[PDB]
Amino acid sequence: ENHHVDYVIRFNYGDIDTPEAIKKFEVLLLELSEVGLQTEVRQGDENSLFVFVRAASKKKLKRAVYQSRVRDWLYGVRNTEPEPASSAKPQSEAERLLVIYHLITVPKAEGGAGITPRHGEWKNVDAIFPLHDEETNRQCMREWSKKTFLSTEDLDRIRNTFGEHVGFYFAFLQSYFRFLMFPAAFGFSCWLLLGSFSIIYTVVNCLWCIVFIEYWKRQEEDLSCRWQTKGVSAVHEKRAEFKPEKEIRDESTGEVRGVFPATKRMYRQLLQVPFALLAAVALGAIIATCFAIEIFISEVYNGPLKGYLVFIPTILVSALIPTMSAVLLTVATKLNDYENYETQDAYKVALTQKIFVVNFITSYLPIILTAFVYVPFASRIVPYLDVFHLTVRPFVSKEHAIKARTEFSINPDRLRKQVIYFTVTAQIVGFALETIVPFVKQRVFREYKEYTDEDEARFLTRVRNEAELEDYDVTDDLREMCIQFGYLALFSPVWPLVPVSFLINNWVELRSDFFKICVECKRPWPQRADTIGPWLDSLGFLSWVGSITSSALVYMFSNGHEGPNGEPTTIRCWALLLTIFFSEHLYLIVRYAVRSALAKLEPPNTRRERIERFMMRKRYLDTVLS
Ligand SMILES: [Ca+2]
Ligand SMILES: [Ca+2]
């Protein structure tokens, strides 16, 4: 059905001249041939060729699979001795696709073709992608669209098709959804019986966050042992953009390495603090200014055309936060390049960590402003917001803009409504923008280009369609789930139905993300992983911060949703600070206890890998060494 194709290499010739294009193309085909791959060339687009790649021989494929397993075993990623090369069948499609992707991409000295798409020698090579297995995808979709949980076999199927990175994301999402049943039930019970800002709800929520994060750390270790990816960072793919200072030739492996001093990278990484403060200043200024405009227009201004003026600050936020975030991403990418980052995974993790500052600010600063600035203050702030009358000025006359004043009277519903927005309406709108609109845009751009050799015209047209799809990044889905967890950990006392909303959304999220991968994206090459990465630390940080924000909220809103109704008088600053101190330190103590208790419970795959290391050394001692 896929015509035995392993990868499609898109070669762009449009932006270069014919002689250089022919020379580069011959070099590409020669490298593919010399690394043991069989090529077939077809017209991809009007400006690109498709190089269809396949293992030239079953013997060569078995040899490459055996060498990959041997490298994994030598670097300690697996403990079982690699089976001989005559029995070296790829145990899944993910393994064959990974071996062939390495053959295509790892440098010539490392034993492959050095095709680095969108790099120096290969800027014409635009994309290297495998083909979706449409029947398997549709079977999986229809099968687990009718179940509650995905089986371990279902997760293994995802890993065997898309690799362990996508597999880890779906395993984490399934575990998060399963753990969300407890806070969903408990928060519905509290919303029914206690209402919001309940001490018991906040305590149970912090305890649940602790338990889920520690359980997932343990489960990640177990799953990386079960998928044979534990310690996979030892064989992390180098990135071709790495600028070494000196070239050293280690004696263990007869190769030059290209060393770069770690302390120099740390000096360059000192610039992350100024970047973080820049992003905080810019994004917080935009967000707080738009919040002040929103407050003025919606609650201080009392002139004509109030809806058409209250839609102003939401528009300005929706236009300016994406733009400022794109600028900050450009700055973060330039800083990530300045830091040298030998490996692609280190580069990706560092960029994700820089972007997490922007994510935190843009996701949580609105609710933080409403909760800890608008509610306690803003009876002392709205006198300073008369200056924002000019935002309404190009619509209303100067006198009508001035005589539009009212008793402020803080809206005791503002905070609950903002939390309900971010945890329900944002979820629905994000589902729409994430699955529906890209799908419709793809179908529209297809029928636009489709409206205005005979035996492979269908396969070739569907390959040309797959070539237009988006490049899936599992980091985006992990980011979304971690930001959602942050909402739960930080602001769930305001509205205890947040975990119910997240439970429903995450059941739908598993299926809709799998659909997006299979239908709206090119099939990702089966990248490996032994963890969700920096997102685990992000979740730990968010739960820590939530122990502070939730206790502050429970203190401030003890008397109800109004709490300090605009005045900071009722808030005793020592009692708020003492609440925060004891809550955060009870949190840290309970987290230490839970982590230490879970460290005493070794999971089965972890214990099996330890015993297997022992058994491998015993086999070595029994065969050689007498
Ligand atoms: Ca979504
Ligand atoms: Ca998603």
Ligand nearest the Cα atom of residue 516: 2
Q: How far is the CA of 220 from the centre of ligand 2 (A)?
A: 20
Nearest ligand to the CA of 169 is: 2
State in Å, rounded, how far the first CA of the chain is from the last one: 53
d(CA 525, CA 313) in angstroms, rounded, equals 42
Please answer whether residues 496 and 557 qualify as being in contact, where contact means their C-beta atoms are separated by less than 8 angstroms.
Answer: no
H-assigned helices in 301-436: 307-338, 344-369, 389-392, 398-402, 414-420, 426-431
Nearest C-alpha neighbor of 275 from the set 341, 348, 349, 351: 351
Experimental technique for the deposited model: cryo-EM
Helices then strands (H, E): number in the chain?
23, 8
Q: Are 178 and 148 in contact (CB under 8 A)?
A: no
Rounded to 5°, angle at Cα 416 from 410 and 419: 125
Ramachandran angles phi, psi of 450, nearest 5°: -85, -15
- Of 262, 209, 166, give the one whose Cα is nearest residue 547: 209
Closest ligand by atom to 479 CA? 2
Number of domains making up the chain: 1
Q: Angle CA(387)–CA(389)–CA(394) in degrees, nearest 5?
A: 135
Tokens at residue 578, please?
């003492």
The residue type found at 372 is: F
Q: Which residue has the tokens 């297809």?
A: 446
Name residue 608's amino acid. Answer: R
Cβ atoms < 10 Å from Cβ of 319: 10
What is the whole-number distance in angstroms between the Cα of residue 571 and the centre of ligand 2? 40
Ligand nearest to the CA of 510: 2
User: Rounded to the nearest whole angstrom, what is the distance from the C-alpha of residue 439 to the centroid of ligand 2?
Assistant: 14
Consecutive H or E run containing 481: helix 474-491
CA distance 140 to 1: 17
Q: How far is the CA of 435 from the centre of ligand 1 (A)?
A: 8
Angle formed at CA 481 by CA 480 and CA 482, multiple of 5 degrees: 95
Interval between CA 433 and ligand 1 midpoint (Å): 8
The Å distance, Cα 513 to ligand 2 centre, comes to 5
* CB contact at 8 A, 64 and 36: yes
Please tell me the distance between residue 536's alpha carbon and the centre of ligand 2 in angstroms.
17
Rounded to the nearest angstrom, the distance between the alpha carbon of 431 and the centre of ligand 1 is 4
Which residue blocks in 600-624 are alpha helix, DSSP H?
604-623
User: Which of 228, 230, 219 has the alpha carbon at shortest distance from 174?
Assistant: 219
Find all residues with CB under 8 Å of 58, minimum gap 6, and list them.
Answer: none
Q: ∠107-110-116 over CA atoms, to 5°? A: 15
Tokens read off for 230: 């534990």
- The C-alpha atoms of residue 553 and residue 560 are separated, in whole angstroms, by 11
Helix (H, G, I), strand (E, B) or coil at 191: helix
Q: Name the residue type at position 365.
A: L
Ligand closest to 476 (CA) is 2
Query: Cα-Cα-Cα-Cα dihedral of 285, 291, 297, 299, to 10°?
Result: -140
CA distance 318 to 287: 10
| Burial classification of residue 252, based on how many CB atoms lie within 10 Å of its CB (0-12 exposed, 13-18 middle, 19 or more buried) | exposed
Determine the Cα–Cα distance for residues 172 and 219; give it in Å rounded to an integer: 9
Distance 168 CA to ligand 2 centre (A): 14
Q: Side chain identity at 621, as an amino acid letter? A: L
Please enumerate, by residue number, every residue annotated as part of a binding site for Ca(2+): 434, 477, 480, 509, 513
How far apart, in whole angstroms, are the C-alpha atoms of residue 50 and residue 257?
33
Q: Tell the burial category of 565 from Cβ atoms under 10 Å away from its Cβ (0-12, 13-18, 19+).
A: middle
Compute the distance from residue 337 Cα to the ligand 2 centre, in Å.
27
Which residues lie across from 238 on neighbouring strands?
A: 343
Neighbours of 245 (CB within 10 A): 11
Ligand nearest to the CA of 517: 2
How far away, in angstroms, is 608 Cα from ligand 1 center?
37
Neighbouring-strand partners of residue 93 = none
508, with CB counted inside 10 A (0-12, 13-18, 19+), is middle
Taking the centre of ligand 2 as the mean of its atom positions, its distance from the CA of residue 539, in whole angstroms, is 17
Distances (CA, A) of 235 to 199, 411, 443, 549: 48, 56, 39, 41
Beta strands per DSSP E along 378-458: none
Centroid of ligand 1 to alpha carbon of 509 (angstroms): 6
Dist. CA 173–CA 154, nearest whole Å? 13
Ligand number with the minimum distance to the CA of 515? 2
Beta strands in 158-261 (DSSP E): 249-250, 255-256
Tell me how far apart the alpha carbons of residues 118 and 139 are, in angstroms, rounded to a whole number: 35
Going by the annotation, the residues of the binding site are 434, 477, 480, 509, 513
Q: Which ligand is nearest to the CA of 477?
A: 2
Among 261, 295, 277, 446, smallest CA distance to 375 is for 295
Q: Which of 370, 461, 460, 355 is nearest to 411 (CA)?
A: 370
| Cα–ligand 1 centroid distance for 447 (angstroms) | 26
Tokens of 324: 């400022």
Distance separating alpha carbons of residues 80 and 73, to the nearest angstrom: 7
Residue 470's SS3 state is strand
Q: What is the DSSP string of 501-557?
A: HHHHHHHHHHHHHHHIIIIIEEPPP----SS-THHHHHHHHHHHHHHHHHHHHHHHT
Q: Using an 8 Å Cβ cutoff, are 235 and 72 in contact?
A: yes
Q: How far apart are CA 69 and CA 304, in angstroms?
A: 72
> Pick from 153, 151, 146, 68: which is nearest to 103 by CA?
68
CA of 479 to the centre of ligand 2 (A): 8
Instruction: Give dist(CA 402, CA 392) in Å, integer.
Output: 10
Cα-to-centroid distance, 356 and ligand 1 (Å): 18
Number of other residues whose CB lies within 10 A of the CB of residue 69: 23
Q: Is-contact 519 437, C-beta < 8 A?
A: no
| Nearest ligand (C-alpha, residue 513) | 2
Residue 443's identity, in one-letter code, is: R
Residues contacting residue 324 through CB under 8 Å, at least 6 positions apart: 282, 283, 286
Residue-wise DSSP of 95-115: HHHHHHHHHHHS-GGGTS---
What DSSP letter does each residue of 117-144 carry, written as one string? TTSSS-SSEEEEEPPP-HHHHHHHHHHH
* Ligand minimally distant from the alpha carbon of residue 480: 2
Task: For residue 292, report the distance from its CA to the centre of ligand 2, in Å.
Answer: 31
For residue 345, report the distance from its CA to the centre of ligand 2, in Å.
21
Helices 164-179 and 498-515, packing angle to 10 deg? 150
d(CA 480, ligand 2 centre) in Å: 6
User: Whose atoms come closest to the Cα of 482: which ligand?
Assistant: 2
DSSP state of 434: I
Domain enclosing residue 293, as ranges: 2-626
SS3 category, 467: coil
Is residue 455 classed as helix, strand or coil in its secondary structure?
coil
Give residue 476 CA to ligand 2 midpoint distance, Å: 7
Q: State the distance from the centre of ligand 2 to the C-alpha of 153, rounded, in angstroms.
A: 22
Q: Which of these, 169, 173, 174, 159, lies nearest to 228 by C-alpha position?
A: 159
CB 376 within 8 A of CB 556: yes
* Backbone Cα Rg of the chain: 28
DSSP 373: I
Q: What is the rounded distance in angstroms from the CA atom of residue 558 to the CA atom of residue 395?
A: 42
Query: Strands 7-12, 37-45: parallel, antiparallel or unpaired by DSSP?
Result: unpaired
How many CB atoms sit inside 10 A of residue 458's CB?
9
427 Cα: distance to centroid of ligand 1 (angstroms): 6
| DSSP class of 232 | G
Measured on CA atoms in the order 219, 222, 228, 230, is the torsion positive or negative?
A: positive
How far away, in angstroms, is 507 Cα from ligand 2 center?
A: 11
Closest CA to 496 of 583, 582, 557: 557
Cα separation of 132 and 124, whole Å?
24
Q: How far is the CA of 61 from the centre of ligand 1 (A)?
A: 39
CA angle 57, 59, 63 (to 5 degrees): 120
Rounded Cα gap, residues 503 and 567, in angstroms: 36
- 255 CB-near residues (< 8 Å, 6+ apart): 109, 249
Ligand 2 centre to CA of 505 (Å) is: 10
Q: For residue 146, report the distance from its CA to the centre of ligand 2, in Å.
A: 19
CA of 606 to the centre of ligand 2 (A): 30
Q: Which of 271, 328, 317 is nearest to 292 (CA)?
A: 317
